[PDB]
PDB file of N, CA, C and O and ligand atoms in Angstrom:
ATOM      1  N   UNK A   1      86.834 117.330  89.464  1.00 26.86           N
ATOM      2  CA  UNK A   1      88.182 116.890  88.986  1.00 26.86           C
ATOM      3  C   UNK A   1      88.560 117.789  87.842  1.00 26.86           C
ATOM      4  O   UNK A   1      87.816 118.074  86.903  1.00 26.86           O
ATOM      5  N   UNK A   2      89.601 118.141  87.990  1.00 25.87           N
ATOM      6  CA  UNK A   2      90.437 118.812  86.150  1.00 25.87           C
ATOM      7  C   UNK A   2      89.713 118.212  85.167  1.00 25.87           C
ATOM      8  O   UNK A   2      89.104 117.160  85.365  1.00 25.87           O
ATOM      9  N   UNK A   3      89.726 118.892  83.933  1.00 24.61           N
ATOM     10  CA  UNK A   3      88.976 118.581  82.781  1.00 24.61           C
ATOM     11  C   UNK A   3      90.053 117.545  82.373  1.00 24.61           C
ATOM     12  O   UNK A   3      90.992 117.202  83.091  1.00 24.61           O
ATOM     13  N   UNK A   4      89.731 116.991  80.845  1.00 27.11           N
ATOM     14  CA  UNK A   4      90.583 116.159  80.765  1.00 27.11           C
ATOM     15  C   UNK A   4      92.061 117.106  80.239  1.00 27.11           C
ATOM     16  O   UNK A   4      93.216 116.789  80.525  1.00 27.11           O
ATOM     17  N   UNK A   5      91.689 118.185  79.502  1.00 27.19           N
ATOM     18  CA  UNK A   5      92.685 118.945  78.966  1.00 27.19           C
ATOM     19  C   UNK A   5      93.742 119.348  80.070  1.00 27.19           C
ATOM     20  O   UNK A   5      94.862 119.062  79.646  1.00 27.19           O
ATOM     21  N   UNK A   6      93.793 119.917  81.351  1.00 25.24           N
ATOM     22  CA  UNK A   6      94.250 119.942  82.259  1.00 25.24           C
ATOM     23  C   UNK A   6      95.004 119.057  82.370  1.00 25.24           C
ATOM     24  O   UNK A   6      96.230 119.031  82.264  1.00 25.24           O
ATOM     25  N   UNK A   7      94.131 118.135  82.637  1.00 27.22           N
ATOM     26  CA  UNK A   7      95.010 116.243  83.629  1.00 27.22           C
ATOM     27  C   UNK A   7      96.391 116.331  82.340  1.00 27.22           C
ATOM     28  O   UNK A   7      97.573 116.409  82.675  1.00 27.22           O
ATOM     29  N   UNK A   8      95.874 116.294  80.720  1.00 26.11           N
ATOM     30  CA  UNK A   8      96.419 115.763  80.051  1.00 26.11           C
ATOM     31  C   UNK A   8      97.967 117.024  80.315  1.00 26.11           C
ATOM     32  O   UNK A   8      99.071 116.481  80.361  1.00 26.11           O
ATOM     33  N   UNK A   9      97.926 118.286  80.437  1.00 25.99           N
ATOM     34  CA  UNK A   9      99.050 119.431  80.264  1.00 25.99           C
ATOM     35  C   UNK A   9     100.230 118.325  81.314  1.00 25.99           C
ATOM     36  O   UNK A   9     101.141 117.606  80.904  1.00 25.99           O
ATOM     37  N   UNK A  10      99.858 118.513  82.445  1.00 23.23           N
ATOM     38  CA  UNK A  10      99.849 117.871  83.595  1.00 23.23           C
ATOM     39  C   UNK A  10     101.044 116.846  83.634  1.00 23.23           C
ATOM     40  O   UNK A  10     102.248 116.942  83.868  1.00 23.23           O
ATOM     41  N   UNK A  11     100.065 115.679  83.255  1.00 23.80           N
ATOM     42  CA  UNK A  11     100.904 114.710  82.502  1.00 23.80           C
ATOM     43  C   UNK A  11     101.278 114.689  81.427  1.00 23.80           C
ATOM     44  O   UNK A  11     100.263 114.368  80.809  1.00 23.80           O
ATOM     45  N   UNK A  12     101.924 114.788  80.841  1.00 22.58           N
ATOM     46  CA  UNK A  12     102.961 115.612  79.818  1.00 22.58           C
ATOM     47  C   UNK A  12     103.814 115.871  80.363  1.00 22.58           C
ATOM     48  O   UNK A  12     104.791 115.137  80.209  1.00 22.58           O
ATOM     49  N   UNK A  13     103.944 117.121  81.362  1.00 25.24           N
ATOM     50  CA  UNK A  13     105.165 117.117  81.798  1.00 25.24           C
ATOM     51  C   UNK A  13     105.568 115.987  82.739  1.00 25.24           C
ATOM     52  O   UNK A  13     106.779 115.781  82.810  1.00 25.24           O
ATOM     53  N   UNK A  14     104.888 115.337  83.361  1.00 20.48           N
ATOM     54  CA  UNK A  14     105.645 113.992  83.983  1.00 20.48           C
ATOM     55  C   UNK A  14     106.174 113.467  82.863  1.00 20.48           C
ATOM     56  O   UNK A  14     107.384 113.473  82.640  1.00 20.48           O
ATOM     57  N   UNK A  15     105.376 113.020  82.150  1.00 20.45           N
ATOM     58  CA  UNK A  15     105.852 111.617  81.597  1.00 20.45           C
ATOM     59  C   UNK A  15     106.860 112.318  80.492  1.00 20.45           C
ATOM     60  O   UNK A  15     107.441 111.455  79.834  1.00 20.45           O
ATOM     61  N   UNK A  16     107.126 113.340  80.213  1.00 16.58           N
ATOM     62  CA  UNK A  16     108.764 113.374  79.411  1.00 16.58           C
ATOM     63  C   UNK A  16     109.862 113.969  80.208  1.00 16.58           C
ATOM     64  O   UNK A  16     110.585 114.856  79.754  1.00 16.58           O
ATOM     65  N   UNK A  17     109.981 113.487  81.368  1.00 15.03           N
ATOM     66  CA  UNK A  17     111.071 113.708  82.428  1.00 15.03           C
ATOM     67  C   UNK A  17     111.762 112.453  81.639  1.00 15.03           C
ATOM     68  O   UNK A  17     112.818 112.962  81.264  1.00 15.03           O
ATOM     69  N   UNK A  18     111.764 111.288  81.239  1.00 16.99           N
ATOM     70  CA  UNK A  18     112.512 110.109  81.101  1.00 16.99           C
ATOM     71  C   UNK A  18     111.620 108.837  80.078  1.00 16.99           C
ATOM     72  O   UNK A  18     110.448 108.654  79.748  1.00 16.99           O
ATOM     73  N   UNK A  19     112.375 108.444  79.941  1.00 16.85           N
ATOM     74  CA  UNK A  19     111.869 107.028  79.195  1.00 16.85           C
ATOM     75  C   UNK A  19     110.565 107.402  78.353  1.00 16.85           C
ATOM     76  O   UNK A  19     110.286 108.601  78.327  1.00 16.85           O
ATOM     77  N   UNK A  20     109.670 106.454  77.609  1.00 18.47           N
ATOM     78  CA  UNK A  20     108.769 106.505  77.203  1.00 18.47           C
ATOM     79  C   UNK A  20     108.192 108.310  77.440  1.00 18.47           C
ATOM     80  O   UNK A  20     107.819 108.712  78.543  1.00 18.47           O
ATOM     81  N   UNK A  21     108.226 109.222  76.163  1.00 18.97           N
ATOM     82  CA  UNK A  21     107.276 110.562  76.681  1.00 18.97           C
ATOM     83  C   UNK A  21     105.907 109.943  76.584  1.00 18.97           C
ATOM     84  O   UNK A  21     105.067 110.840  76.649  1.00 18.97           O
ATOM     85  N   UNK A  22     105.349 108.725  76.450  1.00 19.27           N
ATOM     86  CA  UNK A  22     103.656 109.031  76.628  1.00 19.27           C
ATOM     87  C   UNK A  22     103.406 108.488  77.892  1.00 19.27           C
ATOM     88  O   UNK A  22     102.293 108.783  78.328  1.00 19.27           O
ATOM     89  N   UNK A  23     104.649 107.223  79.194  1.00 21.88           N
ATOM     90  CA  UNK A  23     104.132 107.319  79.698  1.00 21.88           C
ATOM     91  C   UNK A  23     104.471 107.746  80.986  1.00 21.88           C
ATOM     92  O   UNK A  23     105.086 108.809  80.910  1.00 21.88           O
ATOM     93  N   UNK A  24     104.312 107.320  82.256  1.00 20.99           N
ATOM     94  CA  UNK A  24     105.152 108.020  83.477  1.00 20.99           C
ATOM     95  C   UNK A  24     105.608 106.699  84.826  1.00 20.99           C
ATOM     96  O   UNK A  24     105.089 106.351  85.886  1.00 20.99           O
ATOM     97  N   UNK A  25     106.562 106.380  84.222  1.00 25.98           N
ATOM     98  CA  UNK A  25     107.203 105.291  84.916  1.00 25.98           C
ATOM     99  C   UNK A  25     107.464 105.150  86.123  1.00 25.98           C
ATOM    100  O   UNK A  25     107.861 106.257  86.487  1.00 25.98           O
ATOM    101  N   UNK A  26     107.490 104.237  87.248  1.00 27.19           N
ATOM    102  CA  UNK A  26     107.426 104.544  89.014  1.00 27.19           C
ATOM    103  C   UNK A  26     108.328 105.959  89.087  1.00 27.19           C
ATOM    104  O   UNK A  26     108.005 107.062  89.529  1.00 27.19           O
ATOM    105  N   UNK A  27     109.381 105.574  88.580  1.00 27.45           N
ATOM    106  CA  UNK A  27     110.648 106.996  89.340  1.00 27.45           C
ATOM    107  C   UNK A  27     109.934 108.715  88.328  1.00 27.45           C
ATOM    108  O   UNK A  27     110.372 109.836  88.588  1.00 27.45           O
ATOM    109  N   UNK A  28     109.343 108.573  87.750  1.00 25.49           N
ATOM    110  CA  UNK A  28     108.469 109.786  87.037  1.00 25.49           C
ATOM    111  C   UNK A  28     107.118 109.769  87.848  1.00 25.49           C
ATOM    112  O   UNK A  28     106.486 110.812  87.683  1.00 25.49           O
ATOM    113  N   UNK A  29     106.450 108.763  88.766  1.00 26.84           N
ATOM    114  CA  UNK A  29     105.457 108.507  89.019  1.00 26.84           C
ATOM    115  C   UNK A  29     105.855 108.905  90.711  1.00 26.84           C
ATOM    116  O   UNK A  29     105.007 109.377  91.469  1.00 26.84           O
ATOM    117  N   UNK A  30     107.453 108.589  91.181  1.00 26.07           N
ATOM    118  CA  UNK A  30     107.787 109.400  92.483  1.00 26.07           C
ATOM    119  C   UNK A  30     107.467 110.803  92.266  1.00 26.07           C
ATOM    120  O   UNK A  30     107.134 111.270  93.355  1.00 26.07           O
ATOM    121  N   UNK A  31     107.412 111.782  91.253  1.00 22.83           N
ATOM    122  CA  UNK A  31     107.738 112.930  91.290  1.00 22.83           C
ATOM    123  C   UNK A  31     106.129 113.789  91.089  1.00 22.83           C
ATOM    124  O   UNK A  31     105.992 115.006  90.968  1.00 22.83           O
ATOM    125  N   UNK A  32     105.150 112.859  91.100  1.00 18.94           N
ATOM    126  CA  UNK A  32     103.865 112.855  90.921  1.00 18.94           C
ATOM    127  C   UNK A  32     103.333 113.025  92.317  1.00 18.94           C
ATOM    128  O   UNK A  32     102.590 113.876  92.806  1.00 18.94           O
ATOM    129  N   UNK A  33     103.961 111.918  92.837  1.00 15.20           N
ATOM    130  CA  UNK A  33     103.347 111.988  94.293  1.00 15.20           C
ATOM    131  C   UNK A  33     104.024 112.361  95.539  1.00 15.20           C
ATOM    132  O   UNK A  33     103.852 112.032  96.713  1.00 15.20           O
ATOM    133  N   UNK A  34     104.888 113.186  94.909  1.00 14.70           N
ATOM    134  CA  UNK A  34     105.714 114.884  95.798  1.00 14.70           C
ATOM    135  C   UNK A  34     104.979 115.773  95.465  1.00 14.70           C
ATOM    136  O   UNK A  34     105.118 116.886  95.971  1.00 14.70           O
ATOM    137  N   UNK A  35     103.959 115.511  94.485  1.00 16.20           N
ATOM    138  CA  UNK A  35     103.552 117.043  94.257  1.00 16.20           C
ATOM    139  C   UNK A  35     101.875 116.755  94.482  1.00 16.20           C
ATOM    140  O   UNK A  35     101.121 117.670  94.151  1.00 16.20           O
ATOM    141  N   UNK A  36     101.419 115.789  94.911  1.00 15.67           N
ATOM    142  CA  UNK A  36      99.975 115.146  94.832  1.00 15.67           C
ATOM    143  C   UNK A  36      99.945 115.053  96.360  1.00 15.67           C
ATOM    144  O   UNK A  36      98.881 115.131  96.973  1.00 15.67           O
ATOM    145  N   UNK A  37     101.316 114.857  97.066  1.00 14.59           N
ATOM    146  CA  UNK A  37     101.283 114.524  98.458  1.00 14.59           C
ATOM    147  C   UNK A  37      99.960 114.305  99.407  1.00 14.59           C
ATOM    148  O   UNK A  37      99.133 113.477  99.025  1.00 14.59           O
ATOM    149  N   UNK A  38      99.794 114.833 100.310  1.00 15.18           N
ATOM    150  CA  UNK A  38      98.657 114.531 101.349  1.00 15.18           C
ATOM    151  C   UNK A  38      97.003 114.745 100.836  1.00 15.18           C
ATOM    152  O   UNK A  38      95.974 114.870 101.500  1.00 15.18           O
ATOM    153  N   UNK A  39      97.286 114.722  99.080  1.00 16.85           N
ATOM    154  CA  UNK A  39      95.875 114.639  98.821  1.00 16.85           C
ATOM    155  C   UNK A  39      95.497 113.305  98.644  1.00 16.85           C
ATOM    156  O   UNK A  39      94.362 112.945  98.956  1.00 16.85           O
ATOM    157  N   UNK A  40      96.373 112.480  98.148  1.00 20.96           N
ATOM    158  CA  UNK A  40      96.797 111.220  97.695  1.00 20.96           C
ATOM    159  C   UNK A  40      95.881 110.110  99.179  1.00 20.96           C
ATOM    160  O   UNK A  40      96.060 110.259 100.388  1.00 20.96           O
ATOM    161  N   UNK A  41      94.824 108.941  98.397  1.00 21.13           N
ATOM    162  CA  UNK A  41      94.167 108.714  98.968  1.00 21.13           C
ATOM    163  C   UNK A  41      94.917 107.478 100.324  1.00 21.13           C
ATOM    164  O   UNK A  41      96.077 107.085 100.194  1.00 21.13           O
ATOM    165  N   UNK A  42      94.181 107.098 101.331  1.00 22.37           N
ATOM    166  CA  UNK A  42      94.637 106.302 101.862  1.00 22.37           C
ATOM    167  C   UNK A  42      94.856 105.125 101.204  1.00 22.37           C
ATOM    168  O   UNK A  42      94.127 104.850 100.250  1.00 22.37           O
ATOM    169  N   UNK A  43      95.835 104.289 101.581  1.00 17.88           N
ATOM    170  CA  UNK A  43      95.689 103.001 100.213  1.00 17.88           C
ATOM    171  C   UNK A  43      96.173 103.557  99.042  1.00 17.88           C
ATOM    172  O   UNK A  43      96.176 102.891  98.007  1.00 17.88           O
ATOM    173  N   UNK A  44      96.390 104.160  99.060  1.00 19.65           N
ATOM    174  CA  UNK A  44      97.121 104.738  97.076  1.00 19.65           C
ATOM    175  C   UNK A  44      98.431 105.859  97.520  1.00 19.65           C
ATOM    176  O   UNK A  44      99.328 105.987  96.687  1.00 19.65           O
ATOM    177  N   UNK A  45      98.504 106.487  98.545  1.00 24.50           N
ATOM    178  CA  UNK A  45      99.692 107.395  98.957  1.00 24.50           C
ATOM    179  C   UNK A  45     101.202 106.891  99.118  1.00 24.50           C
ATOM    180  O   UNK A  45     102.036 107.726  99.466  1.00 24.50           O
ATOM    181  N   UNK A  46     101.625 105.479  98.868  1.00 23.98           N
ATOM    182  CA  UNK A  46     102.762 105.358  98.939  1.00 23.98           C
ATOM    183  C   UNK A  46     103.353 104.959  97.650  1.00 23.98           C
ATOM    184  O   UNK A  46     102.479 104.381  97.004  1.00 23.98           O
ATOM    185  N   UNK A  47     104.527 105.023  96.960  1.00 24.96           N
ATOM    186  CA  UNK A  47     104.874 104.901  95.787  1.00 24.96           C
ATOM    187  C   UNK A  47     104.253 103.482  95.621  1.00 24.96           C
ATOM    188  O   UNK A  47     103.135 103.483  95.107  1.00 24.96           O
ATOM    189  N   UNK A  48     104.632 102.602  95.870  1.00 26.43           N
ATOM    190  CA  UNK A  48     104.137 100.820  95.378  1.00 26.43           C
ATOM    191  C   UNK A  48     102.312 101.241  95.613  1.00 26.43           C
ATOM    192  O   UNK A  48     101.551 100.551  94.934  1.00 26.43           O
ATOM    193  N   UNK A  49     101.878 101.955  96.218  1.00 30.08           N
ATOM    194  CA  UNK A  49     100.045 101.891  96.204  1.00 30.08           C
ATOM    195  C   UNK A  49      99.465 102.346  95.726  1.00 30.08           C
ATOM    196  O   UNK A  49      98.239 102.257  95.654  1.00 30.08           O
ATOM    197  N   UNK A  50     100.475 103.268  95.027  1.00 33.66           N
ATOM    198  CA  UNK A  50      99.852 104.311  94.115  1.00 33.66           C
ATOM    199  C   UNK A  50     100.140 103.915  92.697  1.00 33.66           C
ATOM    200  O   UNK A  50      99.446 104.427  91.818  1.00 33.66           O
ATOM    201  N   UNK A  51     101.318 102.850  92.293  1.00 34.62           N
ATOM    202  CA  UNK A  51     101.171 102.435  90.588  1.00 34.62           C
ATOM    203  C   UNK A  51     100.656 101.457  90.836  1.00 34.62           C
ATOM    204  O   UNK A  51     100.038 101.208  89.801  1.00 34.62           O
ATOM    205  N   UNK A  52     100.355 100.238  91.915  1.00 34.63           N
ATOM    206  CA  UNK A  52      99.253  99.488  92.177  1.00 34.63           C
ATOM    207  C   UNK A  52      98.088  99.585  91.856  1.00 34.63           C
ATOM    208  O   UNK A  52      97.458  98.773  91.178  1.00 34.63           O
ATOM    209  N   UNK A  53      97.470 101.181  92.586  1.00 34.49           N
ATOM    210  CA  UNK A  53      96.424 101.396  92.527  1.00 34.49           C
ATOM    211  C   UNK A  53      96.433 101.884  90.615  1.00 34.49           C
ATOM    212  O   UNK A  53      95.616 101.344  89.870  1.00 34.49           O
ATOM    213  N   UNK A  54      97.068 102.535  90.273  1.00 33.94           N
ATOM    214  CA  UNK A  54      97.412 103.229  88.876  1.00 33.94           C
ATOM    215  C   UNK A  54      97.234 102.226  87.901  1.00 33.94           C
ATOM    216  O   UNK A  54      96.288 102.306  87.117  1.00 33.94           O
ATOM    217  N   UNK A  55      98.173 101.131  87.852  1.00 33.18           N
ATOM    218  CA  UNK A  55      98.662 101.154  86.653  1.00 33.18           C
ATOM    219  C   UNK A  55      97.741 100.018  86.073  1.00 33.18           C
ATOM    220  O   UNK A  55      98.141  98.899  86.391  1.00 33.18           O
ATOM    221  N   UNK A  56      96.547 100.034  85.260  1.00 36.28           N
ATOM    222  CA  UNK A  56      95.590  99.033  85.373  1.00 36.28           C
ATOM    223  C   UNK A  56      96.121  97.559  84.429  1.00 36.28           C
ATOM    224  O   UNK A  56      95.594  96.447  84.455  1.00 36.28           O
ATOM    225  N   UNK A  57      97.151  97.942  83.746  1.00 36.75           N
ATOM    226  CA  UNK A  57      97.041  96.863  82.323  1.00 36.75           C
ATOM    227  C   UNK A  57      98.762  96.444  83.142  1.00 36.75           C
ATOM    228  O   UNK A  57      99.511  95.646  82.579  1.00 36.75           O
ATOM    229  N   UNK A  58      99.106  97.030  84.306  1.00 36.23           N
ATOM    230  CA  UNK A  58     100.454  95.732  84.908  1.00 36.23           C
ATOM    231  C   UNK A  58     101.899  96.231  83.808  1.00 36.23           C
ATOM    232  O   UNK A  58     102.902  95.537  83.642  1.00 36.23           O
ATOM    233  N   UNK A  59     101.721  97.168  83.369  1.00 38.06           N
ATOM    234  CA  UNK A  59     102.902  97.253  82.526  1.00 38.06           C
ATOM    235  C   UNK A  59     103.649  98.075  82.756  1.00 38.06           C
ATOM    236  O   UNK A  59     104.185  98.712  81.849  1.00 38.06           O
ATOM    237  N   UNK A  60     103.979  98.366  84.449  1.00 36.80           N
ATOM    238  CA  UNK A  60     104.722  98.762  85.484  1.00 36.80           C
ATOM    239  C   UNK A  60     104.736  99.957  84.709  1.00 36.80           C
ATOM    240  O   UNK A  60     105.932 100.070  84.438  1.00 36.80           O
ATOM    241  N   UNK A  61     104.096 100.992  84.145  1.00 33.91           N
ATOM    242  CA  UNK A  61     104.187 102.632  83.753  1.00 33.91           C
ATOM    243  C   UNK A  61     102.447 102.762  83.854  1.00 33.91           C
ATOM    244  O   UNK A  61     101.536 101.939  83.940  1.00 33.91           O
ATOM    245  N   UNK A  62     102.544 104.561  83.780  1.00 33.33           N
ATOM    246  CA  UNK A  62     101.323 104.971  83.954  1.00 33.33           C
ATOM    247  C   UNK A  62     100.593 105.667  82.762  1.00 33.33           C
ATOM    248  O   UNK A  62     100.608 106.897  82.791  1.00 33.33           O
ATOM    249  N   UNK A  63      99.870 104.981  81.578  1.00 30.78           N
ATOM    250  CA  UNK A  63      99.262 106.329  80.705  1.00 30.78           C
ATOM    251  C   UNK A  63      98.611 107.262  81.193  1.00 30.78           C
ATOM    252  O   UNK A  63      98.307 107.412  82.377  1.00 30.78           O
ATOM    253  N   UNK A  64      98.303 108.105  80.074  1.00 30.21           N
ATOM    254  CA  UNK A  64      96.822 109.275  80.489  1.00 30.21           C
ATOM    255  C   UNK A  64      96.086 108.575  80.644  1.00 30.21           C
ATOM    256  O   UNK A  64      95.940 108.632  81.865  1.00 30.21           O
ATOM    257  N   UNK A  65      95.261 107.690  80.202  1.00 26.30           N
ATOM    258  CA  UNK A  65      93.806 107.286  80.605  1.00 26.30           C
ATOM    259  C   UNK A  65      94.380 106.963  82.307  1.00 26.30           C
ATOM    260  O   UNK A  65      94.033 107.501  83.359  1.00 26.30           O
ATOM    261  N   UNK A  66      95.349 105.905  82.052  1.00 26.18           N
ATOM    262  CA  UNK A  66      94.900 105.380  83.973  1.00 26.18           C
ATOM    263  C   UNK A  66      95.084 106.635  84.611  1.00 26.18           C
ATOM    264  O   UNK A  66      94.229 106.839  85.473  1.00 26.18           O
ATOM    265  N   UNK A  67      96.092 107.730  84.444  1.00 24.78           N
ATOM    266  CA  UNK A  67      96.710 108.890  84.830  1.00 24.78           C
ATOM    267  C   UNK A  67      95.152 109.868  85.232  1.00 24.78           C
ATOM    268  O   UNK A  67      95.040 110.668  86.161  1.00 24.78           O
ATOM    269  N   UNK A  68      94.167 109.517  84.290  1.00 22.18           N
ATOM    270  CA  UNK A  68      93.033 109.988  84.246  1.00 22.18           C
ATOM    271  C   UNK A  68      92.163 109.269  85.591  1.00 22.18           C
ATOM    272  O   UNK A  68      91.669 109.830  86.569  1.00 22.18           O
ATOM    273  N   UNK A  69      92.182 108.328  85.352  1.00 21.87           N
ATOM    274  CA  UNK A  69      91.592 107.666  86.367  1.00 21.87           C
ATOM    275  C   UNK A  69      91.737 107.714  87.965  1.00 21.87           C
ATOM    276  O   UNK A  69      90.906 107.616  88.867  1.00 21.87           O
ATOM    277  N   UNK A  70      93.133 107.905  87.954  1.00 21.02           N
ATOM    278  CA  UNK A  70      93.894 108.367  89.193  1.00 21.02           C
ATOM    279  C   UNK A  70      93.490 109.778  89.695  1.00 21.02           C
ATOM    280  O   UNK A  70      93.488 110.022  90.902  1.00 21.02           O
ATOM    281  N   UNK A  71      93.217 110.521  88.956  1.00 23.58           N
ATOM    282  CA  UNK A  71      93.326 111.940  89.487  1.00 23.58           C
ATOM    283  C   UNK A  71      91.438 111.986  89.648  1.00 23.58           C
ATOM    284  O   UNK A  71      91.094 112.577  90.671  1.00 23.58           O
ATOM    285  N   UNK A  72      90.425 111.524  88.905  1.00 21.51           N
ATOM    286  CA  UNK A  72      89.193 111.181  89.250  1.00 21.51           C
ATOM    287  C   UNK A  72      89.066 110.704  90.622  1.00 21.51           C
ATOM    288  O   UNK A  72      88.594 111.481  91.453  1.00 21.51           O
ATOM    289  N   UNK A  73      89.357 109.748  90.908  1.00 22.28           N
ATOM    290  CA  UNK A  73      89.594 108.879  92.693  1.00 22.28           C
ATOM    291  C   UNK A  73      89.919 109.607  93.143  1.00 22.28           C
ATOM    292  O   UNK A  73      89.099 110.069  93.937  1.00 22.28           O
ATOM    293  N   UNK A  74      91.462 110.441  93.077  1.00 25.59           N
ATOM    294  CA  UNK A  74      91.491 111.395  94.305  1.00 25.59           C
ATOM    295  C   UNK A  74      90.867 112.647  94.513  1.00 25.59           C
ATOM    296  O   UNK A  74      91.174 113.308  95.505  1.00 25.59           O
ATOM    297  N   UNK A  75      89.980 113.079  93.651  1.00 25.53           N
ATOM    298  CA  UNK A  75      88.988 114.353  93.812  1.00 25.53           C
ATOM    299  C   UNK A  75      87.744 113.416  94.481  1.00 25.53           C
ATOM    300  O   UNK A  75      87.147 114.141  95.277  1.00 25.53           O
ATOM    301  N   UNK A  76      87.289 112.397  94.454  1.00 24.21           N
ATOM    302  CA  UNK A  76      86.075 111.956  94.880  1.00 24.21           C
ATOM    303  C   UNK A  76      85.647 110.953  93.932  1.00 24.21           C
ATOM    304  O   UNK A  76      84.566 110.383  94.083  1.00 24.21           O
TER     305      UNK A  76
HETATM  306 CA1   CA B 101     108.216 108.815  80.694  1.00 28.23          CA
HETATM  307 CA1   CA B 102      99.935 100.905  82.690  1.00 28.38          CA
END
């Protein structure tokens, strides 16, 4: 998986497309998984399965840590 320095460049630029810059909200979190496309696991590849699967604390946005977590799962 990307180091964390990576993940973090990464996200950054998602998450200051809009709202909150620390975190990356579903419609910032669509533009994640246009670009994550067919790596994106079964069960986590559709927008609702993927901040499902994401967003651990329910507060319908995505930080770096879960952002971290997400990109861990889909490398293996
Ligand atoms: Ca944001
Ligand atoms: Ca969250």
């Amino acid at each position: 998986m990307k180091s964390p320095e990576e993940i973090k460049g990464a996200f950054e630029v998602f998450a200051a497309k809009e709202g909150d810059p620390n975190q990356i909200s579903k419609e910032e979190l669509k533009l994640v998984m246009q670009t994550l496309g067919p790596s994106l696991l079964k069960g986590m590849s559709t927008l609702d399965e993927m901040i499902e699967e994401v967003d651990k604390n329910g507060d319908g946005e995505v930080s770096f840590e879960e952002f971290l977590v997400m990109m861990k799962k889909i490398s293996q």
